[PDB]
Amino acid sequence: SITENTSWNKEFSAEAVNGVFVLCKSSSKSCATNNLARASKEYLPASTFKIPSAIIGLETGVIKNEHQVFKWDLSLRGAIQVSAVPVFQQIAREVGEVRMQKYLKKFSYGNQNISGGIDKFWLEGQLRISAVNQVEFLESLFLNKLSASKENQLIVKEALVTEAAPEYLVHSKTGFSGVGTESNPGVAWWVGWVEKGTEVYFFAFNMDIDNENKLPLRKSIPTKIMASEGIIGG
Amino acid sequence: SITENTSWNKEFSAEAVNGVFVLCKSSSKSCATNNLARASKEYLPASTFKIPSAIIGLETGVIKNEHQVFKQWERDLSLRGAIQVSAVPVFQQIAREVGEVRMQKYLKKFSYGNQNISGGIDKFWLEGQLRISAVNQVEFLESLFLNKLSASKENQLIVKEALVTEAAPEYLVHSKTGFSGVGTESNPGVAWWVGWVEKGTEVYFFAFNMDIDNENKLPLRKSIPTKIMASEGIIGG
Ligand SMILES: *C(=O)[C@H]([C@@H](C)O)[C@H]1CC(SCCNC=N)=C(C(=O)O)N1
Numbered sequence A: 001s002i003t004e005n006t007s008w009n010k011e012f013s014a015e016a017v018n019g020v021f022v023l024c025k026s027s028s029k030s031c032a033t034n035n036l037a038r039a040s041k042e043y044l045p046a047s048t049f050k051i052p053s054a055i056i057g058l059e060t061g062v063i064k065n066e067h068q069v070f071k072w073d074l075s076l077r078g079a080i081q082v083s084a085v086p087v088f089q090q091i092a093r094e095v096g097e098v099r100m101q102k103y104l105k106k107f108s109y110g111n112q113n114i115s116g117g118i119d120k121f122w123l124e125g126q127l128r129i130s131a132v133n134q135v136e137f138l139e140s141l142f143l144n145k146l147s148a149s150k151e152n153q154l155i156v157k158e159a160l161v162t163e164a165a166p167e168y169l170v171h172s173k174t175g176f177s178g179v180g181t182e183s184n185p186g187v188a189w190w191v192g193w194v195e196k197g198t199e200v201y202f203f204a205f206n207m208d209i210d211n212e213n214k215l216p217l218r219k220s221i222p223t224k225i226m227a228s229e230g231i232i233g234g
Numbered sequence B: 001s002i003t004e005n006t007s008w009n010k011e012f013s014a015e016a017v018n019g020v021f022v023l024c025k026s027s028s029k030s031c032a033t034n035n036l037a038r039a040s041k042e043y044l045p046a047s048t049f050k051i052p053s054a055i056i057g058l059e060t061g062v063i064k065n066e067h068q069v070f071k072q073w074e075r076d077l078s079l080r081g082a083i084q085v086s087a088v089p090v091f092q093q094i095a096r097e098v099g100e101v102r103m104q105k106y107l108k109k110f111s112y113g114n115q116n117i118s119g120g121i122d123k124f125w126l127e128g129q130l131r132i133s134a135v136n137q138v139e140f141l142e143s144l145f146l147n148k149l150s151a152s153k154e155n156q157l158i159v160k161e162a163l164v165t166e167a168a169p170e171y172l173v174h175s176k177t178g179f180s181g182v183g184t185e186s187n188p189g190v191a192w193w194v195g196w197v198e199k200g201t202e203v204y205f206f207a208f209n210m211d212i213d214n215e216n217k218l219p220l221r222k223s224i225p226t227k228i229m230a231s232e233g234i235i236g237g
């Protein structure tokens, strides 16, 4: 029962941005968004796919453990933060089609369509996922409810930490498919969750982008909205 | 074999502080300190004991899991919240439920300092006879980092996560402060800052302690080691 919040539209209007922001408190049953419609629309996950991929990589053994080093050398958190294109293409290849499919089914990940090439389906393949689905997936991860060891889920959760403050911890992941065209604009993402006190907020944001100079709005807009809600005040 | 960096003492002299800093790269086999004599000297762990206490509490089931919540009425605290503030009673309760025997066994497995928990199961680390050196702190944190402690990998990961205090694109700082109090003329209190930095594919373990007889100096337990590590290029100034 996701409710809409017209107030948050102001932040998009201020920048002339077409996109959506989904923010949920405590669980995926209490969400709000500036565009209930786009909230359920499915888009290429791009780099946000690094989250389920890292979990699957660990679960299948492709990634030895939390201390696994990757030659472009990068740590798991380092590889998650940068493009590190070769790293995750290699992880995907090692996992393979059959195992990848099995896990996305277990994870209920978007349309679960990995067609387009084992080492690129999330960047230029048929995979698509919505902001609402991203939140449901991140919630399962937070609760250690994904079909993977709690050990591996915890490893990825710490690898996703991007901001630390005395009162909260922000876990997040960016994503960007590429400029594209007006008849088919690219999509930029920012998803994650904030642990503030004993409370938790899950969020998913995506926006049409036709110029890379608009990329910073992908983080600024959601940060402003969450800052107002007194969640991070960044 | 720990080496002694004389230049580090200038950071202590600048604030007229008596203390020690132990910093190691990759492992405890590559450590440096401003004073070999004090690096091995055991001191009251104070709040730094919350680290093994948290692991033991989780390993014994006393602490349900990572989502365990703890208790003018102040709202409940998360594991991370409880670790960062005083919340001494929270950990006193944990210690009581763990019990003398189990605590003793775990500190033995953890090779935690002098392993002397006598004189009150709920306060041996705050005023008891328990003592641990900066080098021992590093060894302990190293074991935690490698998941080599006698506890589930899961629980070690939960505690390591709860210890995150600074996040930058290039590094993650895990740390824990400590403060026994101001003590007295003949015996001042001790202040600590221990933890480790994951920078890229490298890891740096650190343990700092200083004598302190006035809370006015507390900020120094973080600033002195931060200056030293910042100078070494490990973390931002
Ligand atoms: C993930 O969605 C993309 C890419 C791997 O497809 C990465 C790269 C970028 S922006 C490009 C700059 N690369 C550095 N030289 C992002 C992003 O979303 O900002 N994620």
Ligand SMILES: *C(=O)[C@H]([C@@H](C)O)[C@H]1CC(SCCNC=N)=C(C(=O)O)N1
Pocket: B045, B046, B047, B048, B085, B086, B088, B126, B177, B178, B179, B180, B181, B192, B215, B218
């Ligand atoms: C842990 O060792 C101490 C205490 C429980 O003994 C706690 C409380 C503090 S500082 C208390 C207020 N000081 C004011 N300037 C710390 C700490 O060292 O940060 N941990």
